[PDB]
């Protein structure tokens with residue numbers, strides 16, 4: 188098994204790739220039968236400060252997991268923010284990006300959010316310019332939208 | 341020939357309606373609904389919509405009726421379809437669906453040369469209403485009539501104003517227009 192790890196040998200490693208080698212649209216995402224994956228709904232702007240999504244993907248690629256036990260990760264959010272962020276994510280295998288918005292339902296249907304194992308709702312937008320009760324509008328709206336959605340059994 | 345172009349203006353502030361028509365006499369404490377541009381159907385401001393919040397509280401069937409009148413459809417099923425983010429979709433429809441192509445629509449008719457033009461001269465509103473309802477299945481809402489009384493000479497300001505449900509003894513004129521609710525396309 189030609190597996191490529193880090194120099195320290197504690198994480199899975201892949202050679203560097205351009206962003207478009209992982210970029211996908213709705214048709215391609217629905218073509219791939221994603222299941223038991225992880226969905227990251229990112230509410231980021233184009234000039235918002237970085238979160239460091241590496242720290243979210245690094246623990247998921249530990250070397251004590253068999254390569255078939257790795258959980259695919261798909262990030263749904265803004266694209267320019269992901270252009271900035273991709274410099275630190277290109278070395279993690281089994282990672283996909285679907286540009287768009289997480290509040291749209293077509294994206295969530297293509298991603299197969301009803302077969303996933305976890306949906307992490309993160310927001311990179313700037314904080315505290317308005318009432319403190321109106322800083323988590325996007326997160327609450329996304330949670331309610333996902334809860335109220337209905338799929339086909 | 342450029343003063344006969346029918347145009348409707350949308351205003352941000354409702355106090356600017358004094359600058360739209362020249363032949364009218366302006367006044368600073370007159371309400372928007374009483375000015376001449378609004379009475380003719382030329383100016384429109386969103387402030388008149390501020391009264392739609394109270395009526396919907398007092399009458400729960402008002403909003404449904406007004407949406408049905410001024411939208412031509414938009415059933416909750418269409419809202420659900422649009423809520424999926426995929427946009428408007430459709431194509432050739434089954435004959436059962438195409439039965440929705442017969443709802444009534446608001447239209448405007450004239451008393452000049454139509455089959456019911458006999459009410460233009462000496463006719464009364466009630467006679468025209470009952471005749472249209474009995475014969476053509478048409479319900480009349482109101483009149484849209486020249487502002488100048490001397491329509492024989494047709495004074496240069498050829499503007500019209502609206503009368504809502506005139507009494508049964510209202511006298512008609514050959515140049516009047518009627519708002520109607522037509523059926524069967």
Ligand SMILES: [Ba+2]
Nearest residue numbers: 358361362366
């Ligand atoms: Ba004036």
